[PDB]
C-alpha cells in the first residue's frame, strides 16, 4: 500500500527485500507531508537561494550557432554550488532526513559529484555521512574522494562485484536495510525503488521551472526542445518535468554511446537494452542473454550506468520524450567547441547533451529552432581525462 503511484506505466515499482519496505513507506509519507508543508518548502527555498546560488543563469550561446537558424541557450547548473545539478536534490533529501529524525546519511557515487554534494549537505546540516564508492571509482577519483574527506564524510570502497557504481549502489541498499531507523539513504539519481524517482524529480524540477520563466522572459515563447544527458535520469527529468504538459516542447534525452552502439561498449539501456528488474526497479537494463547485469561504458564516469530511471522509460514508451545517443568522440568535440567558442568548460556528461544539440543544428542549419541544453555540471574534473586523450591522439 502506498500514498502515491510507484509505477510509470509498467516501469518502476519497489523491488526490494521485504525488510526494506518500511523504510521506503516511511520516506514516502515524510515526502508527501513535506510537500504540503510551507515551512519545509521555505527552508528548502532558503538553502537553494542563499547557499547553492539559485536561480542559475540561462546563457544564450551566440558564437556556436553563428550562420544557422538555431538559437541555443544553456541552463547553467554548472554554476550551482558544488559544480553540478546534484546539489539541488541532496539539499531536499537532507531536509527530509532531518524531518524523519535521522542523524546519518548513506550515499553512492561513481564519478563523485553526488558524493561530494552529499558530503557538503551533510556538513552544513549536521548529518554524519558515509559514501559507498566502487574501489575502481575510488582509485580513479582521488580528487573527489579527498573533497568528501575534507568535508567530514566517511568514504567506503566497495570491492564486491565489478567494484563499481552498481556494486556501490548495492552496498548502500545493504547498509540502509540494517540502519534505516537512524540513517537515510541519499540516492543520487531519478531511479531505484519508489519513492526515489518521484522525490528526485520533484527536488530537481526547479531546473525546468526556471528555464521556462527565463525563456519566456527572453524569447516570449516556449523552446522547441530541451535536451539533457541521461546517466540515471535526474538532471534530465529535472529539466523535463515542468514542460511535460506543454505538448509543443520536445523532450530529448541523450544516453552515452561509448565507443559506438555496435561495439556493445556503451551506456544506452533505454534504447539498446532490455527491460529487467534490478536496483529496486523494473527498467531497461544492459544485461547478458541469461540475465546477468552487464557492465556499461562511457568516457564520462557520470553516465556509466547500465540502467535508467523508470519515468524516462515511460515517457519514451508513449512518445512524449525521444532518446538518442552520443559517442565518446562526439562528446569530446562538443567539450572542445564550448571551451573555445563560449569560454565555458562543460562536464563530459553535459557535453553529450551539447553534442546532440550541435548535431540538430549542423544537420539542418536552415531549420528555425529554439533549443535549451541542460548544462548539468562544470568540466574542471574532466581536464586531466581530456588532456590524456588529446595527447594520446597527438593534438
Amino acid at each position: 500500500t502506498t500514498l502515491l503511484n510507484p509505477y510509470f506505466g509498467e516501469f518502476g515499482g519497489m523491488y526490494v527485500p521485504q525488510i526494506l519496505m518500511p523504510a521506503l513507506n516511511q520516506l514516502e509519507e515524510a515526502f508527501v507531508s513535506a510537500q504540503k508543508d510551507p515551512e519545509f518548502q521555505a527552508q528548502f527555498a532558503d538553502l537553494l537561494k542563499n547557499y547553492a546560488g539559485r536561480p542559475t543563469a540561462l546563457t544564450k550561446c551566440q558564437n556556436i550557432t553563428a550562420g544557422t537558424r538555431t538559437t541555443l541557450y544553456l541552463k547553467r547548473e554548472d554554476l550551482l554550488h558544488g559544480g553540478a545539478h546534484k546539489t539541488n536534490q541532496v539539499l531536499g533529501q537532507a531536509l527530509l532526513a532531518k524531518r524523519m529524525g535521522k542523524s546519518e546519511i548513506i550515499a553512492e557515487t561513481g564519478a563523485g559529484a553526488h558524493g561530494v554534494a552529499s558530503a557538503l549537505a551533510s556538513a552544513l546540516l549536521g548529518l554524519k555521512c558515509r559514501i559507498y564508492m566502487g574501489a575502481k571509482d575510488v582509485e580513479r577519483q582521488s580528487p573527489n574522494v579527498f573533497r568528501m574527506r575534507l568535508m567530514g564524510a566517511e568514504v567506503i570502497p566497495v570491492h564486491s562485484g565489478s567494484a563499481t557504481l552498481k556494486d556501490a549502489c548495492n552496498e548502500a541498499l545493504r547498509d540502509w536495510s540494517g540502519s534505516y531507523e537512524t540513517a537515510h539513504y541519499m540516492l543520487g539519481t531519478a531511479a531505484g525503488p519508489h519513492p526515489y524517482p518521484t522525490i528526485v524529480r520533484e527536488f530537481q524540477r526547479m531546473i525546468g521551472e526556471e528555464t521556462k520563466a527565463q525563456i519566456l522572459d527572453k524569447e516570449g515563447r516556449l523552446p522547441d526542445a530541451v535536451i539533457a544527458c541521461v546517466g540515471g535520469g535526474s538532471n534530465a527529468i529535472g529539466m523535463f518535468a515542468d514542460f511535460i504538459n506543454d505538448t509543443s516542447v520536445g523532450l530529448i534525452g541523450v544516453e552515452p554511446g561509448g565507443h559506438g552502439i555496435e561495439t556493445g561498449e556503451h551506456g544506452a539501456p533505454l534504447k539498446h537494452g532490455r527491460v529487467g528488474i534490478y536496483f529496486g526497479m523494473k527498467a531497461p537494463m544492459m544485461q547478458t542473454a541469461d540475465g546477468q547485469i552487464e557492465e556499461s561504458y562511457s568516457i564520462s564516469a557520470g553516465l556509466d550506468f547500465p540502467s535508467v530511471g523508470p519515468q524516462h522509460a515511460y515517457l519514451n514508451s508513449i512518445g512524449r520524450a525521444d532518446y538518442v545517443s552520443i559517442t565518446d568522440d562526439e562528446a569530446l568535440e562538443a567539450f572542445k567547441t564550448l571551451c573555445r567558442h563560449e569560454g565555458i568548460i562543460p562536464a563530459l556528461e553535459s557535453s553529450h547533451a551539447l553534442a546532440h544539440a550541435l548535431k540538430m543544428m549542423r544537420e539542418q542549419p536552415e531549420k528555425e529552432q529554439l533549443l535549451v541544453v541542460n548544462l548539468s555540471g562544470r568540466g574542471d574534473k574532466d581536464i586531466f581525462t581530456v588532456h590524456d586523450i588529446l595527447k594520446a591522439r597527438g593534438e
Binding site: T1, G13, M14, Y15, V16, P17, Q18, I19, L20, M21, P22, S160, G161, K166, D167, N170, L173, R174, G276, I277, Y278, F279, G280, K282, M285, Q287, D290, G291, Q292, I293
Partner: protein, 255 residues
C-alpha cells in the same frame, strides 16, 4: 508434488524440527558442488535451499557474495544450475528443494517459463529475495500454476497486515528473518505455511531454540558456506567438516 507437506507431516509424527542448509550451486565448481550437496543430504539435511549465482546479489552479505564469485570463477550459468538441479532430484526423490533467486533471473526469459523449468527439474519452492509481497502477484501466480511454492520472508519489523499477507500468499514454509512468540502464534492463527527460523542459525542450540519457540525448524543461511570457504584447499576435509556440522545441527532438531 507435495514434498514440503509430506516432510512436515513426517516430522510432526516424529516430534522433530526440520534442518535446512543453504549452499550456492556451483560453489566452488560443478563437480565439487554436486558432491557437497550429496554430503549435506547424507548427513541429515531435511531440505535444501540453493542459490543461483547472480551478478548483483543485493540481499547477500559477504560470505555469500564470495560464494557467487567462486561459482562465476568456475564459469557457472543459470542453465548449468538447472542441469545440476535435475541431477540432484534424480538422485534424491523426496528431499524438498528450494531456490533462492534474484528477480532478474526469474523475469529474464519470462516469469512463466522460469517456473515451468523449475517444475520440469523437480524444484519445490522459490524465494525471490528482492520481490516483496507488494510486488509478488505475477511471481506467486506463476509459481502456483507450476506446482511451485512461493516462499516469503517474514522480517523482524513485520506488522499485522504483513502477517496476514504472508500467511495468505506463502506456501511450503514461511521464512522467518514483535516478540518471537507473537510472530509464530499469529502466523499459525492466520494458517500460514510452517515457519522456519532463518535468522543467524549457526549452532545446534539455535536449532533447538527455534523448535521450542514453536517454529517447524531452522535454516542455516550462511554457516555451510563458511565451511566451504575455510577448506577450499582440502576437498576431503571440507566434506568431513560439512558432515560433522550437519550431523550436529540435525541432532539438535530431534531434541
Amino acid at each position: 508434488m507435495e514434498r514440503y507437506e509430506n516432510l512436515f507431516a513426517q516430522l510432526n509424527d516424529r516430534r522433530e524440527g526440520a534442518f535446512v542448509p543453504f549452499v550456492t550451486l556451483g560453489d566452488p565448481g560443478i563437480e565439487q558442488s554436486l558432491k557437497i550437496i550429496d554430503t549435506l543430504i547424507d548427513a541429515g539435511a531435511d531440505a535444501l535451499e540453493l542459490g543461483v549465482p547472480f551478478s548483483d546479489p543485493l540481499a547477500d552479505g559477504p560470505t555469500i557474495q564470495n560464494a557467487n564469485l567462486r561459482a562465476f570463477a568456475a564459469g557457472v550459468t543459470p542453465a548449468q544450475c538447472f542441469e545440476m538441479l535435475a541431477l540432484i532430484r534424480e538422485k534424491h526423490p523426496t528431499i524438498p528443494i528450494g531456490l533462492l533467486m534474484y528477480a532478474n533471473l526469474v523475469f529474464n526469459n519470462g516469469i512463466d517459463a522460469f517456473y515451468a523449468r523449475c517444475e520440469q527439474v523437480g524444484v519445490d519452492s522459490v524465494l525471490v529475495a528482492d520481490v516483496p509481497v507488494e510486488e509478488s502477484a505475477p511471481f506467486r501466480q506463476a509459481a502456483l500454476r507450476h506446482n511451485i511454492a512461493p516462499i516469503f520472508i517474514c522480517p523482524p519489523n513485520a506488522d499485522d497486515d504483513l502477517l496476514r499477507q504472508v500467511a495468505s500468499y506463502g506456501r511450503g514454509y514461511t521464512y522467518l528473518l514483535l516478540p518471537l512468540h507473537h510472530l509464530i502464534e499469529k502466523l499459525k492463527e492466520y494458517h500460514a505455511a510452517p515457519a522456519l527460523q532463518g535468522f543467524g542459525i549457526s549452532s545446534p542450540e539455535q536449532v533447538s531454540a527455534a523448535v521450542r519457540a514453536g517454529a517447524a525448524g531452522a535454516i542455516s543461511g550462511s554457516a555451510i558456506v563458511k565451511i566451504i570457504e575455510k577448506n577450499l584447499a582440502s576437498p576431503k576435509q571440507m566434506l568431513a567438516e560439512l558432515r560433522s556440522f550437519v550431523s550436529a545441527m540435525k541432532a539438535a532438531s530431534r531434541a
